[PDB]
A and B are shown apart, each in its own frame.
Chain A
Amino acid sequence: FVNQHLXGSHLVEALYLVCGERGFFYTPK
Chain B
Amino acid sequence: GIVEQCXASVCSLYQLENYCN
Contacts and interface: CB of A to CB of B under 8 A. Distances in A.
B1 A27 contact: yes
Interface string A1-29: 01111111001001100111011111111
B19 A19 contact: yes
A2 B13 contact: yes
Secondary structure dominating the interface of A: loop
A10 B11 CA distance: 11
B3 A25 contact: no
A20 B19 CA distance: 12
A23 B16 CA distance: 12
Interface of B: 1-4, 6-13, 16-17, 19-21
